[PDB]
Design a protein around this ligand. Structure first.
Ligand SMILES: *[C@@H]1O[C@@H](C)[C@@H](O)[C@@H](O[C@@H]2O[C@H](CO)[C@@H](O)[C@H](O)[C@H]2O)[C@@H]1O
Ligand code: MAN
Ligand code: MAN
Length: 61
């Protein structure tokens, strides 16, 4: 199975604008002949969540 046959969406915009939140992207899966036959379901990545707007949030006086 070539999982890149099913394209990544774009990464989402960040859950926060600082103090570090998360964001995600997922393959655009369609459950066809190729998917069921080549066991893409067992070995292919479906989700990613991660660090975005990482820096410590600034604090004003
Ligand atoms: C997003 O952009 C940055 C430039 C900051 O100005 C952020 O301010 C912070 O906003 C968060 C919202 O999650 C508040 O919790 C913070 O108190 C505030 O400093 C801005 O939201
Ligand atoms: C998601 O990004 C990967 C690289 O990690 C590509 O192989 C894939 O085609 C999709 O764009
Ligand atoms: C997710 O976001 C990264 C930027 O950090 C892109 O380069 C990638 O193509 C995908 O859109």
């Amino acid at each position: 199975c070539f999982c890149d046959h099913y394209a990544w969406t774009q990464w989402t915009s960040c859950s926060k604008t600082c103090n570090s939140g998360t964001q995600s992207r997922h393959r655009q899966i369609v459950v066809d002949k190729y998917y069921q036959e080549n066991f893409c379901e067992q070995i292919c990545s479906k989700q990613e969540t991660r660090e975005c707007n990482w820096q410590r949030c600034p604090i004003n006086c």
